[PDB]
Amino acid sequence: EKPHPLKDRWFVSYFPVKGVELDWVSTAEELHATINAFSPLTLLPPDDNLVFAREKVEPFFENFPNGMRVSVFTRTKVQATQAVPLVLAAVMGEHLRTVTDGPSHADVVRIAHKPGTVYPESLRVEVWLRDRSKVDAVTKYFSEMLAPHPGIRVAGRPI
Amino acid sequence: SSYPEDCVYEIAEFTRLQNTKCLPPKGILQFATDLWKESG
């Protein structure tokens, strides 16, 4: 019944195709309620990004000079229902720390509905890492966590 | 059910909270309401 606190507080913004500052989330219940309010994420306006930033870091590439971007691409609503909670648990839930030997530096999470011609419910979930040295462990982690679902794709690209 | 002292949650325990009845913070709640009103 008691809330499940998050290790860090995360600031929620919405960037339509600068951003709209919304509010802080500091518990797992507030974080899930935020996702439920923007659900189905697959019906969001195309290209808009819903953003969670650790301690309100400004979510721009200039603040991640030697960082990495880990992206999870889904094609269907069932796949989004599997991948999104998993990313939130790894990042806000801090489960990525089981492979990063301390802080993960996964400081920004971005979610966008990116419709394709064949797959209209396609989503793109990005995880921005401030520290490049951990991208190998982070990518392996996401790949293994999402291996049961071969439809979900994981990729790393620099910032 | 589990409340680890370091706030590093097990995946299953974190994901089971997706069915929460808790409301989101007011700034998020109002914005999301207005966003779905502008779609239909």
Numbering used by the authors:
A (entry chain A): 7 to 23, 37 to 178
B (entry chain B): 79 to 118
Task: Give the authors' words.
The structure of T. brucei EIF4E6 in complex with the TbEIF4G5_79-116 peptide (hereafter called TbEIF4E6-4G5) was determined by molecular replacement using the EIF4E6 model predicted by AlphaFold34 as the search model. The TbEIF4E6-4G5 structure was refined at 1.90 Å resolution to a final Rwork/Rfree of 0.1923/0.2219. The final model comprises residues 7 to 178 of TbEIF4E6 (out of 186), with the polypeptide chain clearly defined by the electron density. The exception is the region comprising residues 24–36, which could not be modelled. The electron density maps also clearly showed the TbEIF4G5_79-116 peptide, which could be entirely modelled (residues 79 to 116, plus two residues from the expression vector). In contrast, even though the TbEIF4E6-4G5 complex was incubated with the cap-4 analogue prior to crystallization, no electron density corresponding to cap-4 was observed during refinement of the structure, indicating that it did not bind to TbEIF4E6 under the conditions tested. The TbEIF4E6-4G5 complex shows an extensive interaction surface. The TbEIF4E6-4G5 association involves 10 hydrogen bonds and one salt bridge. The TbEIF4G5 canonical helix interacts mainly with TbEIF4E6 residues from helices α1 and α2 through both polar and hydrophobic contacts. The loop connecting the two TbEIF4G5_79-116 peptide helices, together with the lateral helix, also accounts for a large number of contacts with TbEIF4E6 residues from helix α1 and strands β1 and β2, including a hydrogen bond between tryptophan 114 located at the C-terminal region of the TbEIF4G5 lateral helix and the carbonyl group of alanine 56 from TbEIF4E6 α1.
In eukaryotes, mRNA recognition is mainly mediated by the cap binding protein eIF4E, which is responsible for binding to the capped 5′ end of the mRNA. eIF4E is part of the eIF4F initiation factor, a complex formed through the interaction between eIF4E and the large eIF4G subunit. The remaining four eIF4Es all bind to different eIF4G homologues (five are conserved in trypanosomatids), forming a minimum of five different eIF4F complexes. The EIF4E6/EIF4G5 complex has been linked with the stage-specific translation of mRNAs encoding the major Trypanosoma brucei virulence factors. As first described by Marcotrigiano and collaborators, a curved-shaped α/β structure forms the cap binding pocket on the concave surface of the protein, while eIF4G and 4E-interacting proteins bind to the convex side of eIF4E.
